[PDB]
Amino acid sequence: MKTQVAIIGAGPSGLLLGQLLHKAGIDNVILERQTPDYVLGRIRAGVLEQGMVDLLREAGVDRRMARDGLVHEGVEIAFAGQRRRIDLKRLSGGKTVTVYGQTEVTRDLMEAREACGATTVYQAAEVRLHDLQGERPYVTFERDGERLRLDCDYIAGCDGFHGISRQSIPAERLKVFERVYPFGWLGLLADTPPVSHELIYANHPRGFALCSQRSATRSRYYVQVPLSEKVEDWSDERFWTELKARLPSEVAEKLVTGPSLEKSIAPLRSFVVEPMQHGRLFLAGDAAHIVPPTGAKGLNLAASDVSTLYRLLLKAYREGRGELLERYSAICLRRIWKAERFSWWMTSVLHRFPDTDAFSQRIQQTELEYYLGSEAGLATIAENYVGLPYEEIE
Amino acid sequence: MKTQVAIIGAGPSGLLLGQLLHKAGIDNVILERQTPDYVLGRIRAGVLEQGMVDLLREAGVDRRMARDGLVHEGVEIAFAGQRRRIDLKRLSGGKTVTVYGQTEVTRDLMEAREACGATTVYQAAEVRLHDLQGERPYVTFERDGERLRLDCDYIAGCDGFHGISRQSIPAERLKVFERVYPFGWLGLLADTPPVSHELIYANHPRGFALCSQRSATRSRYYVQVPLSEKVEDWSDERFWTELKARLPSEVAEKLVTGPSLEKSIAPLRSFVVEPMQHGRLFLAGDAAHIVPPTGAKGLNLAASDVSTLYRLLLKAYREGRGELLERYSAICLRRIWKAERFSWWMTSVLHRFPDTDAFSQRIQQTELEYYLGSEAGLATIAENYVGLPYEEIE
Ligand SMILES: Cc1cc2nc3c(=O)[nH]c(=O)nc-3n(C[C@H](O)[C@H](O)[C@H](O)COP(=O)(O)OP(=O)(O)OC[C@H]3O[C@@H](n4cnc5c(N)ncnc54)[C@H](O)[C@@H]3O)c2cc1C
Ligand SMILES: Cc1cc2nc3c(=O)[nH]c(=O)nc-3n(C[C@H](O)[C@H](O)[C@H](O)COP(=O)(O)OP(=O)(O)OC[C@H]3O[C@@H](n4cnc5c(N)ncnc54)[C@H](O)[C@@H]3O)c2cc1C
Ligand SMILES: Nc1ccc(C(=O)O)cc1
Ligand SMILES: Nc1ccc(C(=O)O)cc1
């Protein structure tokens, strides 16, 4: 069995890369550990940068998004009994962000790949990578008992934080940068109209709260929660009461509550690995880096890694410029670090940290007051929020 | 012995306030623990905001400053083998800062006060404050053995961090916010031409370094140093070798060195007290708050506290509006916290901290890269550096 580019993982990174590649004539096979239904069960992201919206268009998978996605020109930050709106469009020079669930984006890509007839092997068990530094690397996996081999020219590791690809690089070739936060986010998806037409990030003494949405009749809410929490300890009613306690009274008053469709706790973490490649293996997305959700950069950084890898692969196959692939890590890391910095800043100013001295609390509050009250401060938030520009390459 | 406003401390705060008050017809007496020469021996500040320059003009003590002070339109930040210039004038909408030593400002004020014949009692020993909540507070002190009493309407505590005024307020009425940094600055004053026409703040792996100046033939340099250091362990030659090691090669190459005129170590600290007054006692300057030197806000915040106190006192005496004095703390604290936030940020991005993990070092470096590479980022530094506007009152 042979292909040009083997892709490990059928989450958004792998699917987007596979779609872009197929449309350009570069054959690729995707190997996924889980089933289509399992992948489709993950809620995750809701906010997309303009760059990701354009990439979906280029992959030709934007029909439903153009119809159903909601374009947001602003976002609100509530703290110390006040709500401040950041006009993203005005402050960033016209850019906006789009709210369209990750589940939906993934569904669109999966349907698109099926229709084109490209290869996808679900339940590909025990994937192993071989001869990464050779001129002919290969992947082995098991499908219903028998171990099969897939030969390829390159391998794109799009297998997330727990994937096999990053584990396949000699640990000594990698530099790991990581920070673990002492809290997680308890998220709740409900078939109820959102409390606002724009997102509301709230810094409240009891902890962080976020009011988001999926459509005009579907909402997604989050509350900061200690790591010791178990989801079974949080009934829907406990969640609504807690969420209400963290929001401005005028917002809590018109909040329409309802039974949860999904409820889960996600731990917050920052993680970056340098470099993002090894021989003929290139890491993309969560496989190479994790950002806390606060800045809504995770799926968006995955999109930029993919945009970059795809364009370099194109140069390699169409133009015989295989040497440009060595620049992959350098190009992606510039964007990754600025997004990590922004996600880290958002996290530190919106959440309540354990054992914080009086000085730090006051500085936290002053950061908000300064950045939300200065035209220059607002612009730094806005340009980072809508997403910094992708680098062009070469 | 009686006056209208008793002022404790003859450093810049006390002198500036006393001068402004005298010029407006409000009698005031200054009590200073040390001698004129001792006060004049402190080097300290070199950078003044436009607001402080205007206050000196209003006090009528700007002749020498207008002649000798250097107006700077920019400043440089060196990090990771690169120097980036921040055009303060362009980015802040036309404001600049002035380099004129604190020693000189103090000398100008002292000469001005002597010529006007206002009262100043040096070597005023064992100053004690009494009946702060009464309608008639008073100050007692000792002059060559005998204990004298000074009656007044109000008392301005301009006695610095170790003064008696803050200690005279019942500790329970005060909220203290403080942060101690694990390093200090070793400063060296030399009669040598500065290495640059603008200041250079340098983040180097060995620690922070700063190239400043006093005039075209006098320089002031600083290097970050551990708290365990003793000045006697730092010969002039050791200092020059260390400074050179922390600067970009092209800057170190044209550095003119020479014997030190003054050498000292200043510990870095952030300190704020709320409120800044008690009864008829009002704290101003270092008596109420300390900021690390990195942002050059100390003397400048003292100027804004003084500007505010003076204007409120004027309203009180000239217009019988004594009730406006209750707003002193609220007005000053707004500016103090934003300046504390800026000084804290500058300190965290330019210095090397003990036991820093890989993630934090990378974030530190990325903060610099982002703020120095974005038009919006540059503007946040510039507007804070030149100094945020003074509030108008009422
Ligand atoms: C609460 C939450 C909110 C978020 N909100 C946002 C937001 O609004 N905006 C945004 O930009 N980002 C957000 N993110 C981040 C975003 O969801 C992730 O960055 C994104 O899922 C990355 O996609 P990926 O394809 O790299 O990895 P994944 O989605 O993790 O997919 C990886 C795939 O590889 C498969 N796989 C794993 N191991 C193997 C193996 N050994 N062999 C074969 N296949 C394997 C997995 O099964 C999975 O299907 C959020 C994340 C969370 C948890
Ligand atoms: C290394 C260094 C660099 C700095 N660089 C800058 C810079 O470039 N720009 C800037 O804005 N700031 C800078 N600062 C800060 C600035 O020097 C201080 O904020 C400033 O001195 C505050 O003035 P002040 O009058 O409040 O207090 P002080 O200058 O401390 O004067 C207080 C006076 O009160 C007297 N006194 C004390 N106790 C008593 C008592 N019990 N009775 C009577 N009198 C008493 C003292 O003797 C002293 O004369 C720097 C500080 C340092 C140390
Ligand atoms: N920053 C975030 C904003 C929104 C969401 C979400 O809608 O799921 C998640 C993170
Ligand atoms: N930030 C600072 C800049 C300059 C000086 C100084 O010249 O003494 C001190 C601090």
PDB file of C-alpha atoms in Angstrom, chain A residues 192-344:
ATOM      1  CA  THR A 192     -30.937  27.398  24.553  1.00  0.00           C
ATOM      2  CA  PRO A 193     -30.612  30.866  22.929  1.00  0.00           C
ATOM      3  CA  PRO A 194     -27.326  32.540  23.968  1.00  0.00           C
ATOM      4  CA  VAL A 195     -27.521  35.315  26.541  1.00  0.00           C
ATOM      5  CA  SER A 196     -25.811  37.758  24.168  1.00  0.00           C
ATOM      6  CA  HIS A 197     -25.094  38.208  20.475  1.00  0.00           C
ATOM      7  CA  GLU A 198     -21.366  38.464  21.289  1.00  0.00           C
ATOM      8  CA  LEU A 199     -19.171  36.526  23.704  1.00  0.00           C
ATOM      9  CA  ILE A 200     -18.737  37.670  27.292  1.00  0.00           C
ATOM     10  CA  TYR A 201     -15.533  36.814  29.127  1.00  0.00           C
ATOM     11  CA  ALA A 202     -15.950  37.470  32.839  1.00  0.00           C
ATOM     12  CA  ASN A 203     -13.371  37.916  35.581  1.00  0.00           C
ATOM     13  CA  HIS A 204     -15.307  37.500  38.822  1.00  0.00           C
ATOM     14  CA  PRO A 205     -14.017  36.940  42.377  1.00  0.00           C
ATOM     15  CA  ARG A 206     -15.446  33.365  42.365  1.00  0.00           C
ATOM     16  CA  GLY A 207     -13.566  32.538  39.166  1.00  0.00           C
ATOM     17  CA  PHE A 208     -13.718  32.905  35.399  1.00  0.00           C
ATOM     18  CA  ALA A 209     -16.924  32.486  33.393  1.00  0.00           C
ATOM     19  CA  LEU A 210     -17.482  32.614  29.609  1.00  0.00           C
ATOM     20  CA  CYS A 211     -20.758  32.923  27.672  1.00  0.00           C
ATOM     21  CA  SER A 212     -20.415  31.609  24.147  1.00  0.00           C
ATOM     22  CA  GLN A 213     -22.655  30.117  21.459  1.00  0.00           C
ATOM     23  CA  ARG A 214     -22.982  27.740  18.526  1.00  0.00           C
ATOM     24  CA  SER A 215     -26.061  29.202  16.761  1.00  0.00           C
ATOM     25  CA  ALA A 216     -29.124  31.305  17.586  1.00  0.00           C
ATOM     26  CA  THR A 217     -30.611  28.375  19.531  1.00  0.00           C
ATOM     27  CA  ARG A 218     -27.510  26.704  20.960  1.00  0.00           C
ATOM     28  CA  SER A 219     -25.239  27.980  23.718  1.00  0.00           C
ATOM     29  CA  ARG A 220     -21.902  26.996  25.200  1.00  0.00           C
ATOM     30  CA  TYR A 221     -20.932  28.188  28.695  1.00  0.00           C
ATOM     31  CA  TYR A 222     -17.775  27.691  30.773  1.00  0.00           C
ATOM     32  CA  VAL A 223     -16.801  28.279  34.370  1.00  0.00           C
ATOM     33  CA  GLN A 224     -13.343  28.037  35.896  1.00  0.00           C
ATOM     34  CA  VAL A 225     -13.139  25.092  38.249  1.00  0.00           C
ATOM     35  CA  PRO A 226     -10.416  23.526  40.489  1.00  0.00           C
ATOM     36  CA  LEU A 227      -8.537  20.475  39.134  1.00  0.00           C
ATOM     37  CA  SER A 228      -9.969  18.322  41.920  1.00  0.00           C
ATOM     38  CA  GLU A 229     -13.455  18.599  40.423  1.00  0.00           C
ATOM     39  CA  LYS A 230     -15.286  15.690  38.891  1.00  0.00           C
ATOM     40  CA  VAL A 231     -18.035  16.374  36.363  1.00  0.00           C
ATOM     41  CA  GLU A 232     -20.477  14.024  38.158  1.00  0.00           C
ATOM     42  CA  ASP A 233     -20.373  16.473  41.082  1.00  0.00           C
ATOM     43  CA  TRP A 234     -21.847  19.178  38.855  1.00  0.00           C
ATOM     44  CA  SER A 235     -25.556  18.854  38.173  1.00  0.00           C
ATOM     45  CA  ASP A 236     -27.032  21.117  35.520  1.00  0.00           C
ATOM     46  CA  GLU A 237     -28.681  23.167  38.258  1.00  0.00           C
ATOM     47  CA  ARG A 238     -25.450  23.606  40.205  1.00  0.00           C
ATOM     48  CA  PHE A 239     -23.781  24.846  36.998  1.00  0.00           C
ATOM     49  CA  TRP A 240     -26.512  27.422  36.190  1.00  0.00           C
ATOM     50  CA  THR A 241     -26.497  28.759  39.763  1.00  0.00           C
ATOM     51  CA  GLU A 242     -22.693  29.062  39.675  1.00  0.00           C
ATOM     52  CA  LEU A 243     -22.642  30.671  36.211  1.00  0.00           C
ATOM     53  CA  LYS A 244     -25.285  33.182  37.336  1.00  0.00           C
ATOM     54  CA  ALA A 245     -23.295  34.048  40.397  1.00  0.00           C
ATOM     55  CA  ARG A 246     -20.280  35.003  38.241  1.00  0.00           C
ATOM     56  CA  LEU A 247     -22.035  37.229  35.723  1.00  0.00           C
ATOM     57  CA  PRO A 248     -23.217  40.871  35.940  1.00  0.00           C
ATOM     58  CA  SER A 249     -26.780  40.895  37.366  1.00  0.00           C
ATOM     59  CA  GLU A 250     -28.315  42.349  34.182  1.00  0.00           C
ATOM     60  CA  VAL A 251     -26.836  39.453  32.155  1.00  0.00           C
ATOM     61  CA  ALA A 252     -27.742  36.704  34.651  1.00  0.00           C
ATOM     62  CA  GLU A 253     -31.344  38.016  34.724  1.00  0.00           C
ATOM     63  CA  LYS A 254     -32.076  37.272  31.046  1.00  0.00           C
ATOM     64  CA  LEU A 255     -30.136  34.017  30.881  1.00  0.00           C
ATOM     65  CA  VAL A 256     -32.307  31.209  29.495  1.00  0.00           C
ATOM     66  CA  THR A 257     -31.210  27.937  31.114  1.00  0.00           C
ATOM     67  CA  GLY A 258     -31.949  24.364  30.094  1.00  0.00           C
ATOM     68  CA  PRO A 259     -30.737  20.731  30.244  1.00  0.00           C
ATOM     69  CA  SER A 260     -27.176  20.024  29.121  1.00  0.00           C
ATOM     70  CA  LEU A 261     -26.472  18.242  25.839  1.00  0.00           C
ATOM     71  CA  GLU A 262     -22.813  17.812  26.880  1.00  0.00           C
ATOM     72  CA  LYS A 263     -20.873  18.570  30.001  1.00  0.00           C
ATOM     73  CA  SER A 264     -17.080  18.135  30.484  1.00  0.00           C
ATOM     74  CA  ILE A 265     -13.962  19.476  32.219  1.00  0.00           C
ATOM     75  CA  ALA A 266     -10.882  20.482  30.235  1.00  0.00           C
ATOM     76  CA  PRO A 267      -7.573  21.174  32.058  1.00  0.00           C
ATOM     77  CA  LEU A 268      -5.625  24.295  31.045  1.00  0.00           C
ATOM     78  CA  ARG A 269      -2.089  23.918  29.682  1.00  0.00           C
ATOM     79  CA  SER A 270       0.583  25.616  27.554  1.00  0.00           C
ATOM     80  CA  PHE A 271       2.944  23.337  25.647  1.00  0.00           C
ATOM     81  CA  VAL A 272       5.369  23.942  22.801  1.00  0.00           C
ATOM     82  CA  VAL A 273       7.955  21.642  21.277  1.00  0.00           C
ATOM     83  CA  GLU A 274      10.956  22.827  19.186  1.00  0.00           C
ATOM     84  CA  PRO A 275      11.564  21.858  16.434  1.00  0.00           C
ATOM     85  CA  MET A 276       8.266  20.603  14.956  1.00  0.00           C
ATOM     86  CA  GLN A 277       9.769  18.117  12.556  1.00  0.00           C
ATOM     87  CA  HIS A 278      12.212  15.284  12.269  1.00  0.00           C
ATOM     88  CA  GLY A 279      13.433  13.855   8.971  1.00  0.00           C
ATOM     89  CA  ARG A 280      10.309  13.216   6.881  1.00  0.00           C
ATOM     90  CA  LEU A 281       7.892  13.662   9.796  1.00  0.00           C
ATOM     91  CA  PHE A 282       6.257  17.091  10.343  1.00  0.00           C
ATOM     92  CA  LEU A 283       4.103  17.809  13.414  1.00  0.00           C
ATOM     93  CA  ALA A 284       0.996  19.983  13.064  1.00  0.00           C
ATOM     94  CA  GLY A 285      -1.618  21.241  15.495  1.00  0.00           C
ATOM     95  CA  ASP A 286      -2.082  19.839  18.999  1.00  0.00           C
ATOM     96  CA  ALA A 287       0.629  17.296  18.239  1.00  0.00           C
ATOM     97  CA  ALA A 288       3.203  20.095  18.429  1.00  0.00           C
ATOM     98  CA  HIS A 289       1.628  22.616  20.802  1.00  0.00           C
ATOM     99  CA  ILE A 290      -1.173  23.271  23.259  1.00  0.00           C
ATOM    100  CA  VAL A 291      -2.531  26.667  24.295  1.00  0.00           C
ATOM    101  CA  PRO A 292      -5.011  27.281  27.076  1.00  0.00           C
ATOM    102  CA  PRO A 293      -8.527  27.886  25.557  1.00  0.00           C
ATOM    103  CA  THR A 294      -8.784  31.468  26.860  1.00  0.00           C
ATOM    104  CA  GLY A 295      -7.431  33.002  23.664  1.00  0.00           C
ATOM    105  CA  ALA A 296      -9.282  30.681  21.208  1.00  0.00           C
ATOM    106  CA  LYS A 297      -6.025  29.973  19.374  1.00  0.00           C
ATOM    107  CA  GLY A 298      -5.739  26.178  19.392  1.00  0.00           C
ATOM    108  CA  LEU A 299      -7.646  25.184  16.262  1.00  0.00           C
ATOM    109  CA  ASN A 300      -6.525  28.426  14.662  1.00  0.00           C
ATOM    110  CA  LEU A 301      -2.819  27.694  15.132  1.00  0.00           C
ATOM    111  CA  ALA A 302      -3.464  24.199  13.729  1.00  0.00           C
ATOM    112  CA  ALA A 303      -4.870  25.902  10.632  1.00  0.00           C
ATOM    113  CA  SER A 304      -1.707  28.028  10.189  1.00  0.00           C
ATOM    114  CA  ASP A 305       0.626  25.018  10.657  1.00  0.00           C
ATOM    115  CA  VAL A 306      -1.443  23.200   7.991  1.00  0.00           C
ATOM    116  CA  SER A 307      -1.496  26.196   5.648  1.00  0.00           C
ATOM    117  CA  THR A 308       2.288  26.332   5.976  1.00  0.00           C
ATOM    118  CA  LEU A 309       2.889  22.596   5.554  1.00  0.00           C
ATOM    119  CA  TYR A 310       0.574  22.353   2.541  1.00  0.00           C
ATOM    120  CA  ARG A 311       2.258  25.246   0.718  1.00  0.00           C
ATOM    121  CA  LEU A 312       5.725  23.811   1.378  1.00  0.00           C
ATOM    122  CA  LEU A 313       4.598  20.362   0.221  1.00  0.00           C
ATOM    123  CA  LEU A 314       3.160  21.931  -2.932  1.00  0.00           C
ATOM    124  CA  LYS A 315       6.507  23.602  -3.632  1.00  0.00           C
ATOM    125  CA  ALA A 316       8.154  20.246  -2.992  1.00  0.00           C
ATOM    126  CA  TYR A 317       5.967  18.216  -5.320  1.00  0.00           C
ATOM    127  CA  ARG A 318       5.040  20.675  -8.020  1.00  0.00           C
ATOM    128  CA  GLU A 319       8.293  22.613  -8.161  1.00  0.00           C
ATOM    129  CA  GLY A 320      10.890  20.088  -7.023  1.00  0.00           C
ATOM    130  CA  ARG A 321      11.890  22.480  -4.215  1.00  0.00           C
ATOM    131  CA  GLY A 322      12.084  19.837  -1.485  1.00  0.00           C
ATOM    132  CA  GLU A 323      14.680  21.841   0.433  1.00  0.00           C
ATOM    133  CA  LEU A 324      12.127  24.482   1.492  1.00  0.00           C
ATOM    134  CA  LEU A 325      10.613  21.949   3.891  1.00  0.00           C
ATOM    135  CA  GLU A 326      13.514  22.571   6.319  1.00  0.00           C
ATOM    136  CA  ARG A 327      11.980  25.981   7.056  1.00  0.00           C
ATOM    137  CA  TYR A 328       8.685  24.539   8.345  1.00  0.00           C
ATOM    138  CA  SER A 329       9.525  24.746  12.070  1.00  0.00           C
ATOM    139  CA  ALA A 330      11.069  28.232  11.892  1.00  0.00           C
ATOM    140  CA  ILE A 331       8.039  29.614  10.096  1.00  0.00           C
ATOM    141  CA  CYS A 332       5.389  28.044  12.344  1.00  0.00           C
ATOM    142  CA  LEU A 333       7.163  28.778  15.633  1.00  0.00           C
ATOM    143  CA  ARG A 334       7.139  32.533  15.077  1.00  0.00           C
ATOM    144  CA  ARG A 335       3.316  32.496  14.998  1.00  0.00           C
ATOM    145  CA  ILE A 336       2.991  29.827  17.682  1.00  0.00           C
ATOM    146  CA  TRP A 337       4.981  31.823  20.257  1.00  0.00           C
ATOM    147  CA  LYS A 338       3.010  35.043  19.728  1.00  0.00           C
ATOM    148  CA  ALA A 339      -0.253  33.117  20.037  1.00  0.00           C
ATOM    149  CA  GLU A 340       1.087  31.327  23.156  1.00  0.00           C
ATOM    150  CA  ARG A 341       2.003  34.731  24.612  1.00  0.00           C
ATOM    151  CA  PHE A 342      -1.494  36.104  23.940  1.00  0.00           C
ATOM    152  CA  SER A 343      -3.240  32.976  25.321  1.00  0.00           C
ATOM    153  CA  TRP A 344      -1.065  33.153  28.417  1.00  0.00           C
TER     154      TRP A 344
END
